[PDB]
Amino acid sequence: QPLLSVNNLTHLYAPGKGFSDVSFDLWPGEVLGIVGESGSGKTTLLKSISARLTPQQGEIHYENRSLYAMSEADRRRLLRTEWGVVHQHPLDGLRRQVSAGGNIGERLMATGARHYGDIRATAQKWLEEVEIPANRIDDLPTTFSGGMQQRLQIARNLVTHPKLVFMDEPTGGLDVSVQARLLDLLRGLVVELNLAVVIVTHDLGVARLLADRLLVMKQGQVVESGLTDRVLDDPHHPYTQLLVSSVLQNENL
Amino acid sequence: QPLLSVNNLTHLYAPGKGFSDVSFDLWPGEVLGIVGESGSGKTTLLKSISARLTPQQGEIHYENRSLYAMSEADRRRLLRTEWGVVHQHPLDGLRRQVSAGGNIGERLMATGARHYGDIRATAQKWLEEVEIPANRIDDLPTTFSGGMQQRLQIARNLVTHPKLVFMDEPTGGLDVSVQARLLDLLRGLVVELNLAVVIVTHDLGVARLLADRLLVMKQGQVVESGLTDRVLDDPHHPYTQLLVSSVLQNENL
Amino acid sequence: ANLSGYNFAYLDEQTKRMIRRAILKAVAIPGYQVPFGGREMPMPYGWGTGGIQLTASVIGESDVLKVIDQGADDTTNAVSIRNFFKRVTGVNTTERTDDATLIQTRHRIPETPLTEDQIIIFQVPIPEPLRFIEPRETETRTMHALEEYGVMQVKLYEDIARFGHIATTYAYPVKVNGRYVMDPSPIPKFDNPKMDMMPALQLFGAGREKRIYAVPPFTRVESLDFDDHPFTVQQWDEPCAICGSTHSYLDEVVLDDAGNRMFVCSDTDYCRQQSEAK
Amino acid sequence: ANLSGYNFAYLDEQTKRMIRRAILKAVAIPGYQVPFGGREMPMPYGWGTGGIQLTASVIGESDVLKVIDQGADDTTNAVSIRNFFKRVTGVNTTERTDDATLIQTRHRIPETPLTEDQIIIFQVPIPEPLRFIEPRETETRTMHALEEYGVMQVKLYEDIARFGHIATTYAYPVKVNGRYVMDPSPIPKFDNPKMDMMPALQLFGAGREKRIYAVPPFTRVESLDFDDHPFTVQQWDEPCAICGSTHSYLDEVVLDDAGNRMFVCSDTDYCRQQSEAK
Amino acid sequence: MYVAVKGGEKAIDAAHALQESRRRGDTDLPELSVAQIEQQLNLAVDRVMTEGGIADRELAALALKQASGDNVEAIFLLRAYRTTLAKLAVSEPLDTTGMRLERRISAVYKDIPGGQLLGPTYDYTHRLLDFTLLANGEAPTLTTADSEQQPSPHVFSLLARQGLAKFEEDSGAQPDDITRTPPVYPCSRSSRLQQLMRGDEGYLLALAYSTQRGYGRNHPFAGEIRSGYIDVSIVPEELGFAVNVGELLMTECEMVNGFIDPPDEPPHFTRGYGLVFGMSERKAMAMALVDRALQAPEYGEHATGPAQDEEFVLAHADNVEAAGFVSHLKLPHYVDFQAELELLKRLQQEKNH
Amino acid sequence: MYVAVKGGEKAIDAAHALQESRRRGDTDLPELSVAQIEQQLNLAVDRVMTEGGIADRELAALALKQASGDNVEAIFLLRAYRTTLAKLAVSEPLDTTGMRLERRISAVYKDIPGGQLLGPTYDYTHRLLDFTLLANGEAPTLTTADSEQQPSPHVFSLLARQGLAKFEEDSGAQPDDITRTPPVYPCSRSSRLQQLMRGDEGYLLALAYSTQRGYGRNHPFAGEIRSGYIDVSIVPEELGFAVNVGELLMTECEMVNGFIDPPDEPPHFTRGYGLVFGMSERKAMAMALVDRALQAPEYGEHATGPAQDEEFVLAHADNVEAAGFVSHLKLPHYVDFQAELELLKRLQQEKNH
Ligand SMILES: Nc1ncnc2c1ncn2[C@@H]1O[C@H](COP(=O)(O)OP(=O)(O)O)[C@@H](O)[C@H]1O
Ligand SMILES: Nc1ncnc2c1ncn2[C@@H]1O[C@H](COP(=O)(O)OP(=O)(O)O)[C@@H](O)[C@H]1O
Ligand SMILES: O=P(O)(O)OC[C@H]1O[C@@H]2OP(=O)(O)O[C@@H]2[C@@H]1O
Ligand SMILES: O=P(O)(O)OC[C@H]1O[C@@H]2OP(=O)(O)O[C@@H]2[C@@H]1O
Ligand SMILES: [Mg+2]
Ligand SMILES: [Mg+2]
Ligand SMILES: [Zn+2]
Ligand SMILES: [Zn+2]
Ligand SMILES: [Zn+2]
Ligand SMILES: [Zn+2]
User: Residue span of the signal peptide, if any (chains E, F)?
Assistant: First the structure.
């Protein structure tokens, strides 16, 4: 049975703004990439399926429990201990006045961790995992660069080894080397720990290397979906063809 | 003579945070790319050379006038009428409580525009230039997606046809199609109007297609510089080699 | 004469001299809000203390003082201020604009054009034209220093986009001498044109906010507007019910509970002149 | 007896009944701040009104009331509250903890262990343990509802990272019955252990903030801490200068301007018992 | 060795005796009478009534006398006395159109039906200390005009009939009573107004002033201020029909505020309301201004000042609470402070290691 | 047709006569004496002196009498009277260690050198309305103890000698004078304290209370509150040596605030300071609390409450300004309101088109 099941999900701020009639499944150890036009409803959908925006229509089932039929307490418990959420703007997923170490350790303590030294050591290890120097642990995120904030948010949302991570453009602000580090980290987590990921991205290379399936969104509607390689290499919808044709081609020397 | 001349520029928050001893020239109708590790000092340098951060050492000359020896009034006049600045976080370059039309029209009115209808028409034309529907003119940027905010910021900073535009990761949050639209727009402005651009980017494809020269920054130091194609295809510094090797390769069907 | 036990014009000489230096600086820097160490008056802050201090620092024994509020000499506060000045100076007073050497006003410029050697002193609550856009002095001071007036232009453009018109109807901001954005005091837009290239010296006092500024004679004062939304003054469908004038700012007098009203000149001296002409 | 012209315990029966319903709800929901329609007392808000109202709503004619402030019965406010209750109830009063049926306290739990049928009533300024992290009730209410206690854990961890220790020294937050994070009132951390599995019923009143909460007898109360930074109580290098006790919370009495001081038990009844034993 | 001694009760009694003697002052002077305070310090009495919650001039004057003129202490005295009294009735809603006017002014029109009635006011006085009051004097013999009270319709009624403002309609909603249930944020407008009426005059004045200076501007005009006697009526269960129990001197302030342009109705002025006991007006004006500021959620207004922050304003408005909690610092805090000192000494020792 | 008539002057005179008659009240009662207000309403006098800027009890009582007990109007009367007087001297700095104590308490230690001297206070009284004050009574015959004043060193001196707090050092900086130059934000601590001393009691109390409730917490303990007589000395140019011109009754409050851990010194308590004329304390306490709150820029503190917003607090603290500007809405505003009306009518017509 699917870890997450989305049926006829709809949320529209206005006639065209948001998403309408979105359905998909997700299982453990799988990545659902979401690509499409800027302003197509990807962030809105990610919020809705991550218990942050009540849909107007449709249902979300997590482990065969309707997401928005649950109590608010249960949803917050899921978002504290079970799920991870990486926001498009990194600071939206961080505590500005809390050090990086504290930002990471909040999640660990939410899972019952109560040893300060172990929490700090894990935070430093995860800072080194995302190539943030461990000597920045006590610095506030406001002193971090955009990419550093992004990586801190990722580390904060991955430290508890969640069963399901929603990510909005996680590679934003990352250099290609640290981007590759992050892709390897996520792939390893998915394959080993059976982590499931829903990743919104505009980098079709990241989608190709990471996403097991893809959803192409235009004007709030999923216009194409299926195997990532099939969608990117054999697009059927005109918009998907335009998107793949707009990719910046590289050359091999 | 160079439009912008940077000599021995240095600004360090701490021993390693920021940039140190940076020198380069820029001329009209040219694009200086800045690439490097997240947290290497690119945003700090861009702020310093854009009259937003006083350097500790070195000099910046704009049209043969020292930038920080000028009055604050002159620097603000440059940033109002002469220059454009695109921030890494789009909202930092936008007025949250001002409509998109107002965000664009502020710059026009700063250049002496005083016809409301013409200002609104130009704002709509530039919204269509960045593929934002013209019917979003009266909506606040808070209702915009991240990429929409990015494109609104770009339109706001390009509407006055500035002689020099500093951009921090302008393609962040943009789909590949609208990214290509933006690249064509910037290239056309550079070639026709002799616009000069200093663009920080992590997408080496954008740098290759847009930048005439590159600076590569690691830990606040320019470790490599020169012709874009030479830097990317014949890197000498180990970090540049690592960066180019980390690029996500694509395939042609 | 002054026979009340107070110094002439009620201010000590030190305060007069400080205010006079402030006036001279304001004149030399048109539109710029000159801070000054204003003092508490017998009138509460917000009831005209700045204008009172300016008049006390400029007035002499031979001056003919005119005090108006809402364009009328008989207004309560106008009567109070004028009686105070009669007590502490003994100067001659008039309701006739053309005979006044000093005119202290609240929210009106007289319809009768001012002339050389006349000084008109405005009572100003908020001397900062950017205050309602930016409540903090720490920011508006810098904006005036750097001529960073974009928030005002954005306010005007957003007003047009929202309502189709500029929302401000009184205290309408004006550019003075091509440089300084200045608050003209809460006069209606109707009066702003009179400030442009006027033979009289205009002084502006904000006692509570501790500012003095000035527009010298024959100085450009241009209301901020747009070519397709040009500065337009208040209009009424009716003339003055008393003198019949169609060229004056009108005040609406509610006559009965059944909605019957009339409109009469705010400038009572102008109204009297018009009524005597006919 | 009650011979002052006021109802017994000074509260009208409606207020007593409302407070009693609040007490019962608080008992059924340990650690949860029960709002209640508290009234203004003869003591100012912030001088113990919540404890006064609780005691007035629970006290009877056969109760033996003990009132302490800073652990001392003779403290000014303790004397005031106790005299008020003697006036409006006539109940017997004691300074001896073991003879008290009701103990109203400010900032101390007595060293003498409490016993069954005893009720200890705490005066609480801030009933919300998250208030200094989150000043707004609109947020702390939801955080308690959803058990969203992360800001508190983050505060503790940041305190350790900054100073090497948790900065809170009194009103140290405690988890009650495994669920509710509760403010134990401004008692020093020294007293927090006494709250765990205590035979007496603990009541907490915040009159100004309009809250009542409770810890029933034999309920788990665990101070928030870390394994490597375990909950530690205040310690002193000196014993009590009077009774010689090393197991009591000490207050520092400054004796002279030359830095000479002494330390004496805050719990004056415990100090008297110890002094009589020796 | 040192032995504890009892000093609390006798020190407290001596302190209270000292305060009572200071209150009496020089016995060569006659003791002030509560009637004198009620008559000649009537504005202080107005404030004490409004903020103490009881509109009994004699009780407010008594509290002022007992408080040595301390308005805060007197307000607390009256508020506490309220707790000892039973609620014998709830009045029928006041009808301010029936007020017998002592004063009625409007800033929005030069002249209005019923006229500008200045009444007893310090407005337009020259605030020069009147040293003749250092000795007994003669009050002016008042001049007299016609005795008839002209019709004085509310200015907002004239605004609303033109469509410039919206009538305040009564849907029959049951008012919230913060004296029986603690406030729950966000509070209804009825609860907010009840709290504002009880709020500190100075705090609310400063908040309104900040709103006038751009921190949450509401573009206010004093549409109407009335001060006069309003009849109070109840419906006792014994008789079942309304009885007039007397009249109260009250001041009512209606402020015109910033107009709005709602999606589906003509643009119109907003409005604020203030109501206080007695003649003192500035409390009513500040109450109306802050009421409009706290109306922000209704109008979807983006807050630009603390006056629009409902919890910050209302939670700290009641000076009974604020004065009590600020004064409580005078209470012994040495256990707490010892807990602080122990931590600080350990921190210093660790840093100096 | 309608003709204009003169009504302003006579209406104003009648209004002022009405106010004077109301101030006198019932002539059967004896007229209040300024001496009576000074003696028996001494806390109101304390507030009027502190906020009006003149420490002259008789003048404050006169203002209160003239203001009909309106503390705001009396404060403005005294403040305005200040403008008519010449500055004959500037005092040497006050030395509060020389105060002759009426009252001295400390919350941070149970007992201190010099003892807890409660003095005349309403603290620990049961606020029950004393109806015996409705008639003449007898003040208590005060009990007497030893007449010697024990040494009462400042508690902060004892804190600083231990290294727990920092001595307030004098570098000789020239104080700013907001009575001669308008404030320039950010203001020095001297200017901020001068403004706080003149600030509205209720506003500052509410701000301090909000700080106690987490809106910019400063962890305050009432380190010491003293009330007593302090000598004033000057150095006249005529003689060139110091002369004692008398003594003033003043209250001083020193608050211990939350400790800090600076990079290169031992951690120590911060502190706040309050100083007022007379016995009323809560103004001094609130002044110290808000002074500490406004010390945020010095300590690099991230603001969490309006009490830390310097411009918002200080620009609206003076009740002379705030009351004046709020009351000014009572002034005729019909020209501006007519402009507003014209715009609104045009907007309505355009929407309804
Ligand atoms: N709060 C809001 N109010 C109105 N419209 C909104 C709001 N938030 C987002 N939108 C609109 O909804 C659409 C979807 O936004 P979003 O899901 O963020 O796009 P993207 O897929 O680029 O993340 C956009 O066109 C945006 O303008
Ligand atoms: N306000 C600040 N205080 C201290 N350090 C800072 C501050 N802002 C940036 N830094 C540090 O300076 C370095 C350069 O940052 P930045 O120029 O933003 O990097 P990038 O090149 O990724 O944009 C980073 O390592 C960052 O942590
Ligand atoms: O600060 P002051 O004392 O100099 O008063 C200036 C102005 O402030 C008030 O506002 P207003 O424009 O309505 O008229 C009043 C007065 O004229
Ligand atoms: O709100 P109340 O009236 O019930 O008073 C509760 C507490 O608030 C104050 O703070 P505190 O803990 O120092 O002691 C005082 C008092 O006991
Ligand atoms: Mg998005
Ligand atoms: Mg950057
Ligand atoms: Zn006319
Ligand atoms: Zn002992
Ligand atoms: Zn306390
Ligand atoms: Zn006004």
Answer: none
The amino acid at residue C98 is D
Coil/strand/helix, residue F131: helix
Sign of CA dihedral B10, B14, B15, B19: negative
Three-class SS of chain B: CCCEEEEEEEEEEECCEEEEEEEEEECCCCEEEEEECCCCCHHHHHHHHCCCCCCCEEEEEECCEECCCCCHHHHHHHHHHHEEEECCCHHHHCCCCCCHHHHHHHHHHHCCCCCHHHHHHHHHHHHHHCCCCHHHCCCCHHHCCHHHHHHHHHHHHHCCCCCEEEEECCCCCCCHHHHHHHHHHHHHHHHHHCCEEEEECCCHHHHHHHCCEEEEEECCEEEEEEEHHHHHHCCCCHHHHHHHHCCCCCCCC
Peptide bond preceding C129 in cis form (omega within 30 of 0): no
Instruction: Fill in the amino acid letter for C277.
Output: A
The full DSSP string for A175-233 is: -HHHHHHHHHHHHHHHHHH--EEEEE-S-HHHHHHH-SEEEEEETTEEEEEEEHHHHHH
| Beta-carbon count within 10 A of F101 CB | 16
CA A160 to CA A106: how far, in whole Å? 10
Contact B99 C153 (CB under 8 A): no
Smallest CA–CA distance from C159 into chain B, residue: B102
Chain E residue nearest residue F104, CA to CA: E330
Asked if F210 is an interface residue toward chain E (Cβ–Cβ < 8 A), one would say yes
> Strands B31-36 and B213-218, how do they pair?
parallel
For residues D140 and D180, the answer to whether their CB atoms sit within 8 Å is no
CA F161 remoteness from chain centre: 31
Q: Is C47 in the pocket of ligand 3 (CB under 6 A)?
A: yes
In sequence order, the 6+-apart residues with CB closer than 8 A to the CB of F180 are C37
Q: Which of C50, C205, C207, C243 is catalytic?
A: C243
N residues, chain D:
278
Which of the following is catalytic: C90, C240, C244, C259?
C240
Sheet of strand D221-223: strand arrangement: D180-182, D174-176, D221-223
The angle formed by the CA atoms of residues D26, D29 and D31, to the nearest 5 degrees, is 80
Alpha carbon distance A100, A142 (integer Å): 10
Q: Of the residues D31, D48, D51, D71, which is catalytic?
A: D31
Beta bridge partner(s), residue D252:
D263
Q: How was this structure determined?
A: cryo-EM
* C196/C203 Cα distance (integer angstroms): 14
User: What CA–CA distance (Å, rounded) separates D46 from E318?
Assistant: 13
Residue nearest to atom 6 of ligand 3 (CA): C125
| List of chains touching E (3+ CB pairs within 8 A) | C, D, F
Write out the DSSP string of C103-133: EEEES---SSPP-TT-EEEEE-S---TTTTT
Helix axes E57-66, E71-83, angle to 10 degrees: 120
Q: For residues B200 and B195, give the distance between their C-alpha atoms in angstroms, rounded to a whole number.
A: 16
Distance E107 CA to ligand 3 centre (A): 14
Would you state the structure tokens that stand for residue F135, as one six-digit string? 């008639």
Nearest residue, CB atoms, F110 vs list D77, D253, D257: D253
The answer to whether residues B221 and B24 touch, using CB atoms and an 8 Å cutoff, is: no
- In this structure, what token pair is assigned to residue C65? 């003082």
Would you call D31 a catalytic residue per the annotation?
Answer: yes
Closest CA to E306 of F294, F196, F313: F313
- Residues flagged as binding site of A for ATP: 36-43
Scan for tokens 């108006």, then name that residue. C68
Among candidate residues F224, F243, F250, F71, the one with its CA nearest the CA of residue F159: F224
Phi, psi of F41 (to 5 degrees): -120, 45
CA torsion sign, F105 to F111 to F114 to F117? positive
**Taking CB atoms and an 8 Å limit, are B173 and A143 in contact across chains?**
no
Given phi > 0 = left and psi -120 to 50 = alpha, else beta, which region is D250?
A: beta
